[PDB]
Amino acid sequence: QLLLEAERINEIDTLAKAHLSNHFNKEVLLAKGYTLKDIMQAQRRELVRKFVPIEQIKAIAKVSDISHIDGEILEQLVSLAKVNIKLRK
Amino acid sequence: VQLKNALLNCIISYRFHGIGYVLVKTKDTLIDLEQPVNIELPIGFEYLDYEYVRDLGV
Numbered sequence: 094q095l096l097l098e099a100e101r102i103n104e105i106d107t108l109a110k111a112h113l114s115n116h117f118n119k120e121v122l123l124a125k126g127y128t129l130k131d132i133m134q135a136q137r138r139e140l141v142r143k144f145v146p147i148e149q150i151k152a153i154a155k156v157s158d159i160s161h162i163d164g165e166i167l168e169q170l171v172s173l174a175k176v177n178i179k180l181r182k
Numbered sequence: 183v184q185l186k187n188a189l190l191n192c193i194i195s196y197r198f199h200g201i202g203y204v205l206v207k208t209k210d211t212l213i214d215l216e217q218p219v220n221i222e223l224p225i226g227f228e229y230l231d232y233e234y235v236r237d238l239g240v
Contacts (some may be wrong), residue, residue, distance in 0.1 A: 111209070112209055112210075113209060113223075114209055114223050114224075114225055116223065117223075139222075139223075142220060142221035142222070143219075143220065143221060143222045144220075145220075146220055147220060147221075181214070181217060
């Protein structure tokens with residue numbers, strides 16, 4: 094499942110790259126000293142804020158701050174963000 | 183650095199015309215500018231010419 098989860102990691106990276114700034118690039122993030130799992134979750138949090146409105150975050154995640162939501166709840170948040178970009182286009 | 187450059191023309195347009203516009207550019211497409219922004223780090227700042235801006239009011 095190492096390759097299977099790598100594609101999922103790549104899937105989030107591709108959509109994050111085309112929406113987030115180049116300051117959130119995996120290369121520069123690695124230089125600052127963040128682990129691969131930390132990089133992915135941090136990228137996930139930014140995408141939710143960019144697309145998902147704050148009111149939805151206050152409902153699905155039950156709190157405003159996403160700094161302590163990494164995990165299954167974060168997966169639900171990014172799932173709504175993926176829906177958000179589809180309707181935006 | 184880009185904010186300072188955009189702010190210089192904004193004040194000049196403010197003094198000459200009465201209003202100034204500065205665009206906060208993000209990682210988005212030209213059609214996405216209509217959509218609102220919730221939270222996003224910007225890519226840069228660009229001053230918008232007064233003659234090319236149509237505003238109907240507050």
